[PDB]
Ligand binder design. Structure first.
Ligand SMILES: Nc1ncnc2c1ncn2[C@@H]1O[C@H](COP(=O)(O)OP(=O)(O)OP(=O)(O)O)[C@@H](O)[C@H]1O
Ligand SMILES: [Zn+2]
Lengths: 229, 525, 224, 142
DNA sequence: GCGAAAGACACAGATTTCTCCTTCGCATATAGGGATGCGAAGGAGAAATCTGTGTCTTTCGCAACCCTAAACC
C-alpha cells in the first residue's frame, strides 16, 4: 500500500524494488527505459519522498477498515513548503498534494511567487502592518485579481505587492532614455551619450533595445504618411 | 619586479649575514613586503576526473564572483567539496612545514569497472605567479600507484612563513566554507552549558563553519567590550605597573612552588605567558594602540548595515551574566526571539567580520584583506525583497574577496552580470550521461525575473493547468477566424466564469475578435 | 523555416578533397572558416531549422556546427557534396543534435532548398504550429513527421516559450501598424496603394530578427 | 499565508499546534495535561497582563470551542482554561473505540522547521512533530 | 649512500556515555497504624574510544658512462 501510494504520487516512474546483488544490495527505480538508484536523487526529490512516505504511513495506520485508506479526515500544517526545490518542481506540488489526498485540510505557508501562481485567489491571505490610534498591529487582506494561470511576475506584483524589476543603476539609464524618447528629444547630445552607455551595456540585438528603437521608426513613419497626403 | 626573483635574492642574502637587525632593515625585505602586499590571491581553473558521480569536467573560475545554476542528480555541492580539499593543503603547510592535509578516501572513487584512479587539479594565480596542485588516489589492488605533487604549494607557503617570521604583524589569506547545515548552527539559543589572548592562528583550526564558532563569537564580543571599558576608564601607566608587579609576584610564587603539582605549574606558566602577552600589548598600545572602541563600532555598524529595521545593539550585564539586547521599533528583544532569516544573516556576517578582523591586525581598516569564500544556498530563509539586495551589500562591504555561490532563485540571478553565470546540463552522449557547461545568450542584469527565469534557467515561466488548456483552445479558435461557433461559446462561458470579465487577459482576446471581425466586414464588402 | 536561396557554388577548398581521402576530420581550420563565411553569407545569422540566433555582433561564442541533410553512413556519396551542407545550432535537444538519434525514412523529409515550407505550416499567436488543411496524404505525412523528428512542436517549454516571448515583444509594432491602416481606410484611398506601402515598411523593419517567420505570419492575418 | 519576515507566519502555526495538543492528550487519556505557553512568548509591552488563544472545531453540525490562557507575573488572568467542550469529543471517541474494534480516528500532523499499540508494533512513534531531511531513517525503515 | 611522499611507533588528553549514589515517595500485605521493601528521578564520577604531535623508514631513474666473445664480483 505504501509503495503504490508513492507510485501514484509520482507517475513518471514505472516500478521501485529492492535488489540483493552478488556483493551488495540497493533500491532500483525504473523511469522510461533507465534504471536509477535511490542515492542518485537530488535533495528536493528526497524531501518529497520522505514527506509523502510519512503521510501515507500515518494514513494507512489510522484507517484499518476502509477499503481505500486514502479517504480519511484530518488537518496538515506545512511551513515553508518551497524549501530546497527547483522552480520546475514548485509548479506542480500543490496539484499532486490536493489530488492524492482529497479529504484532508491543508494549512501552508510559503515564500516563492512560483507557488502562488497555481493557487486560486479564494484561499490566499496577505499579512500587512498598519498603525491605528498610535498602535501598530497586523492586518489581513486578500488579492484583487485571479492569480491562477498568470505568469511569474504578474503573480509576484499582485499576490505579494512588491517590485518585479530590480532598482539597479543600469536600469536608470534605460528608464531615463525611454522617458526622453517619449517627449520627442532623441537628438540632444545628452540622449546620444546615454544611448552610447545603454548600447554598450546591453548590445545592439538585445530585445529591449530593439523594442526601444521600434518607437522611433513608428513616429518617423507616422509623420511620413501624415505629410504624404 | 618579479616576486620570485626578489624571494631568491633575499634567500641568498640571508645566508651570508648572521646579524638579525641588518636583515630586519635590509632593502630586500622591504621590497619583498611591498611586492607581497599589492598582490591579489585568486584561483584560476579546476578539473575533475572520476570523482564521485562526475566523469570528466573542466571549469574556469571568475576572479570576482561565480554562480552555478541547474538541477541534476550528481549535485552542485560536490564541486565545492573538491575545492575545499585543495585549500586544506595550503593551510596545513602554513601552520608547520610538511604537515599532512586531507586525503581522498577509497569509497569516493567511481564504482565503474573501467576506472582505476581519481584526481583533482587546481591552479592558483597571484599577479604573475602561477602554482598548480594535483591530488590523486588509486583503487585498492591497482597494479600502479599514484602520488600527490606538492612542490608548488610548499613553495608558496614558504614565502608566507618567511615574511611572518621577521615581521610580527603579517597578514594571511582567508578561507571559509558555509554549508547548508548552518541553519542548525544559527538555531543555537542560550549558552546551554574565555581565552585571555587571541592570535591569528586560532581561526586556522578548521575550514568549515560549525556550531562552536558561535559560542566563541560571544566570548570574543565580551572581551572586545571589556577592553573598550579600560579606554573609557582612562587607565594610566599605573595599571601597567600593577600588572607588572602581579606578574613578578606570580613568578616568585612559581619559583617557590618549583622547590619542595604538574597541572598547577603548567597553569602558573600559562598565566605568566598571558601576563607577558598583556605587557607586550600594553607596550604596543603606546604605538598608536588599535582603538578597540573603533573595532567595536565597526563590527556593530557592519552588522546593522544588513538589518535596516533595527535601531541599536547593546550588551547588558545582569544576573551575573551578559546578554545581547536588540532594539527594534520601540521594543527590546533577545537574540532568541528573532526569526530564522535574521538569525542566519546575523551569524553569517558576524563570523565573516570576526575572521577578517582577527586575520589583519596591521591594516587600518581590516575589512580589505584578501581571501576566498564559498557559500551554498545563498537564498536560505529570505523573502524576495531581501533577495534583490544581498549581492550589492556583499560585494560592497568586502570588495577584495572572491565568492563562489550556488543559487536556486531567479530574483538573485537577475542582479548579476551574464559573464558570471555557468549552466550545468546532462547530455546522454554515446549512451552515457555527461556534464556540459553553457552561458546565457543575452545580458540578464536589470531584466525582469520572468526573463531571467526563461534565459538563466531554461524553464517555462507559465504553468500548464487545465484552465490554461481552455485558454489555449479558445485562443486557437478565435485566432483561426472560426470564433463564431457553439463550441467557442461553450468554452468562453467557462473562461469568463473562471477568470472574470474584468481580467486584463480577456480584454486582449476581445480586441483581437473585434479587429478580425472588422477585417472580415471590409473584405466581404 | 524559409526558402533558402542557394547561390552559385563556392565550395573552394571542398573541391580539393575527394572520395579517396574521405576523413571529414581531416578538413583544415582555414577550410572551415571559408565554409562558415559562405554559410553566413547565404543563411544570414539564424539557425536553419529553429531560426535561433547563432552569431553575435562581433569572448564567449554561440555554439554552432555543420550538418549533413542526408546521413553520412548511408549516403557517403554526398559526403563532400556542396548541396548537403547546412549550419545548425548547438542546442542539445533539437535540430542536428536531435536528428541523429532518431529512426526515420529520409525520402519523407522536407528540404528548405527544394520546396517552400510556407505551404504546410501556419504559426499562431501563442507559439504553437498548426498544419494547414486540404493537403494530400503524402504532404500531411511529411508535415507531421518533420516536426516529430525535429522536436519543433513540444507540449510546453523549449522553442515554444521563446517564440511566444518574441511575438509578445513584437506585438506593439503590429498593433500600431494595423491601427494606422485602419485609420487610412476610414477616410478613403486605394487599397493596393496603402497595402504596398505598409507591407514594404514592415518588411524593411523585420529584416534580421529572431523568428522572423512567426512574426511574418502573425502580421498578415491581423492586416485587413 | 503570504508575508515578509517577522510577520507572525509561524506564530499562527504554533498557536494551532498548542490548540491540537490538548485534544490529542485528552484523546489518549482522560484529564491529561497538554502543552503550555512559554513565559518568553508573552508580549513585551508595558500594559500587557495575560495571553489567550481561542478555537472552534466544526464536525458536520456539531460545534465545539476551547480557550487557553496564561498570566505574565502576578496579574489577574481570565481565571483558568475552558476544556469542557473538548472532553465531550474525547469521551465520544473513547466510547466509540471501546466497543467496536478497528474504528477510525482523525489525523493531526505538523511538519515544522529545523528549530531544535499499532505504532509501537512495527517501529513508529506517536508524536505530533516530524522533521524532513531524514531520508536515512526512512530508508532503514523501508 | 639515500630525493619526495605516506605509515608505523610512542605518549598525551579529551569527551560523550554510562553506571553507582542520594532522597523521599510509595505500597501493600498486615480495623487504623506502622514497617520491610521497591520504584523514580537527579547527580555523580568513572572509562573506552578517538584524536593530535614528534621522531624515524623507505630507497630515487640520482650533470660528469662505453660500444668484441665467454664466466665471476
Ligand atoms: N516576546 C516578544 N514580544 C514582542 N514581539 C516578539 C516577541 N517574541 C518575538 N516577537 C516578534 O516576533 C517576530 C517574528 O515572528 P515569527 O517567528 O512569527 O516570524 P516569521 O518571519 O513569520 O517566522 P518564520 O521564518 O519562522 O516563518 C519578530 O519580528 C519579533 O518582533
Ligand atoms: Zn537550431
Amino acid at each position: 500500500s505504501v509503495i503504490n501510494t508513492i507510485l501514484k504520487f509520482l507517475p513518471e516512474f514505472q516500478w521501485i524494488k529492492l535488489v540483493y546483488g552478488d556483493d551488495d544490495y540497493k533500491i532500483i527505480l525504473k523511469k522510461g527505459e533507465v534504471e536509477l538508484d535511490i542515492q542518485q536523487l537530488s535533495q528536493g526529490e528526497k524531501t518529497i519522498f520522505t514527506l509523502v512516505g510519512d503521510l501515507a504511513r500515518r494514513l494507512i495506520l489510522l484507517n484499518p477498515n476502509l477499503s481505500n485508506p486514502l479517504l480519511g479526515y484530518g488537518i496538515v500544517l506545512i511551513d515553508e513548503i518551497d524549501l530546497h526545490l527547483h522552480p520546475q518542481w514548485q509548479q506542480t506540488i500543490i496539484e499532486r498534494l490536493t489530488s492524492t489526498f482529497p479529504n484532508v485540510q491543508f494549512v501552508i505557508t510559503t515564500h516563492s511567487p512560483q507557488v502562488l501562481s497555481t493557487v486560486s485567489s479564494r484561499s490566499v491571505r496577505i499579512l500587512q502592518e498598519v498603525e491605528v490610534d498610535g498602535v501598530n498591529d497586523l492586518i489581513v487582506s486578500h488579492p484583487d485579481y485571479q492569480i491562477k494561470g498568470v505568469s511569474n511576475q504578474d503573480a509576484l506584483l499582485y499576490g505579494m505587492r512588491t517590485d518585479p524589476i530590480p532598482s539597479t543603476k543600469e536600469n536608470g539609464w534605460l528608464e531615463e532614455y525611454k522617458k526622453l524618447v517619449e517627449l520627442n528629444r532623441y537628438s540632444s547630445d545628452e540622449a546620444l551619450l546615454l544611448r552610447e552607455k545603454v548600447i554598450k551595456h546591453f548590445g545592439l540585438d538585445h530585445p529591449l533595445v530593439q523594442e526601444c528603437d521600434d518607437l522611433i521608426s513608428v513616429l518617423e513613419f507616422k509623420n511620413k504618411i501624415n505629410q504624404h497626403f | 619586479m618579479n616576486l620570485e626573483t626578489c624571494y631568491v635574492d633575499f634567500l641568498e642574502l640571508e645566508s651570508h649575514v648572521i646579524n638579525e637587525d641588518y636583515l630586519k632593515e635590509s632593502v630586500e625585505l622591504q621590497k619583498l613586503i611591498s611586492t607581497l602586499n599589492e598582490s591579489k590571491f585568486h584561483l584560476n581553473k579546476i578539473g575533475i576526473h572520476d570523482f564521485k558521480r562526475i566523469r570528466e569536467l573542466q571549469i574556469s573560475l571568475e576572479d570576482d564572483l561565480t554562480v552555478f545554476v541547474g538541477d541534476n542528480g550528481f549535485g552542485k555541492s560536490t564541486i565545492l567539496d573538491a575545492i575545499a580539499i585543495v585549500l586544506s593543503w595550503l593551510r596545513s603547510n602554513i601552520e608547520k612545514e610538511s604537515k599532512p592535509g586531507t586525503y581522498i578516501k577509497s569509497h569516493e572513487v567511481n564504482n565503474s569497472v573501467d576506472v582505476e584512479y581519481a584526481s583533482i587539479d587546481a591552479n592558483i594565480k597571484l599577479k604573475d605567479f602561477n602554482t598548480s596542485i594535483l591530488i590523486t588516489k588509486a583503487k585498492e589492488g591497482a597494479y600502479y600507484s599514484r602520488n600527490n605533487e606538492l612542490l608548488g604549494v610548499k613553495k608558496l607557503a614558504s614565502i608566507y612563513r618567511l615574511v611572518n617570521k621577521y615581521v610580527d604583524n603579517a597578514s594571511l589569506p582567508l578561507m571559509a566554507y558555509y554549508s547548508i547545515a548552518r541553519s542548525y548552527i544559527g538555531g543555537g539559543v542560550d549558552r546551554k552549558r574565555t581565552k585571555t589572548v587571541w592570535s591569528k592562528f586560532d581561526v586556522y583550526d578548521e575550514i568549515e563553519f560549525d556550531r562552536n564558532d558561535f559560542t566563541d563569537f560571544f566570548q570574543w564580543l565580551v572581551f572586545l567590550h571589556n577592553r573598550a571599558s579600560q579606554e573609557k576608564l582612562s587607565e594610566s601607566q599605573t595599571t601597567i605597573n600593577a600588572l607588572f608587579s602581579d606578574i613578578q609576584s606570580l613568578k616568585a610564587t612559581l619559583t617557590q612552588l618549583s622547590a619542595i603539582d604538574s597541572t598547577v605549574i603548567k597553569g602558573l606558566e600559562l598565566s605568566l605567558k598571558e601576563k607577558l602577552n598583556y605587557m607586550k600589548s600594553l607596550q604596543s598600545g603606546e604605538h598608536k594602540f588599535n582603538n578597540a572602541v573603533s573595532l567595536y563600532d565597526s563590527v556593530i555598524n557592519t552588522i546593522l548595515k544588513f538589518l535596516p529595521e533595527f535601531q541599536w545593539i547593546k550588551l547588558v550585564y545582569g544576573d551575573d551574566d551578559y546578554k545581547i539586547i536588540l532594539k527594534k521599533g520601540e521594543v527590546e528583544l533577545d537574540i532568541q526571539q528573532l526569526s530564522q532569516g535574521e538569525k542566519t544573516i546575523f551569524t553569517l556576517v558576524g563570523d565573516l567580520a570576526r575572521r577578517l578582523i582577527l586575520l589583519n591586525p596591521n591594516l587600518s581598516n581590516p575589512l580589505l584583506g584578501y581571501g576566498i569564500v564559498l557559500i551554498d544556498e545563498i537564498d536560505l530563509h529570505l523573502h524576495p525583497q531581501w533577495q534583490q539586495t544581498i549581492i550589492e551589500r556583499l560585494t560592497s562591504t568586502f570588495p577584495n574577496v572572491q565568492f563562489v555561490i550556488t543559487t536556486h532563485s531567479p530574483q538573485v540571478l537577475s542582479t548579476v552580470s551574464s559573464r558570471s553565470v555557468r549552466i550545468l546540463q546532462e547530455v546522454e552522449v554515446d549512451g552515457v550521461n555527461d556534464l556540459i557547461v553553457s552561458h546565457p545568450d543575452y545580458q540578464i542584469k536589470g531584466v525582469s525575473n520572468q526573463d531571467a527565469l526563461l534565459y538563466g534557467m531554461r524553464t517555462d515561466p507559465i504553468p500548464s493547468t487545465k484552465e490554461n488548456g481552455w485558454l489555449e483552445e479558445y485562443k486557437k479558435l478565435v485566432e483561426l477566424n472560426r470564433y463564431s461557433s457553439d463550441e467557442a461559446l461553450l468554452l468562453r462561458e467557462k473562461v469568463i466564469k473562471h477568470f472574470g470579465l474584468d481580467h486584463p487577459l480577456v480584454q486582449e482576446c476581445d480586441d483581437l475578435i473585434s479587429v478580425l471581425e472588422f477585417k472580415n466586414k471590409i473584405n466581404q464588402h | 523555416m524559409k526558402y533558402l536561396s542557394r547561390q552559385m557554388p563556392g565550395p573552394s577548398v571542398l573541391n580539393k578533397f575527394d572520395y579517396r581521402r574521405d576523413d571529414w576530420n581531416s578538413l583544415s581550420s582555414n577550410d572551415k572558416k571559408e565554409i562558415w563565411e559562405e554559410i553566413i553569407k547565404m543563411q544570414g545569422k539564424l539557425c536553419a531549422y529553429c531560426e535561433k540566433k547563432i552569431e553575435h555582433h562581433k569572448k564567449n561564442k554561440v555554439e554552432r556546427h555543420i550538418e549533413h541533410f542526408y546521413r553520412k553512413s548511408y549516403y557517403k556519396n554526398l559526403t563532400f557534396e556542396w548541396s548537403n551542407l547546412f549550419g545548425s545550432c548547438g542546442e542539445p535537444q533539437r535540430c542536428g543534435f536531435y536528428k541523429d538519434k532518431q529512426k526515420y525514412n529520409d525520402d519523407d523529409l522536407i528540404k528548405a532548398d527544394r520546396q517552400n515550407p510556407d505551404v504546410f505550416f501556419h504559426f499562431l499567436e501563442n507559439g504553437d504550429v498548426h498544419i494547414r488543411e486540404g493537403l494530400n496524404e503524402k504532404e500531411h505525412k511529411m508535415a507531421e513527421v518533420t516536426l516529430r523528428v525535429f522536436n519543433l512542436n513540444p507540449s510546453s517549454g523549449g522553442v515554444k516559450a521563446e517564440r511566444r516571448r518574441a511575438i509578445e515583444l513584437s506585438m506593439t509594432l503590429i498593433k500600431e501598424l494595423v491601427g494606422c491602416a485602419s485609420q487610412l481606410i476610414e477616410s478613403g484611398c486605394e487599397i493596393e496603394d496603402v497595402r504596398s506601402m505598409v507591407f514594404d515598411e514592415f518588411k524593411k523593419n523585420v529584416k534580421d530578427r529572431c523568428f522572423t517567420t512567426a512574426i511574418k505570419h502573425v502580421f498578415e492575418n491581423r492586416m485587413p
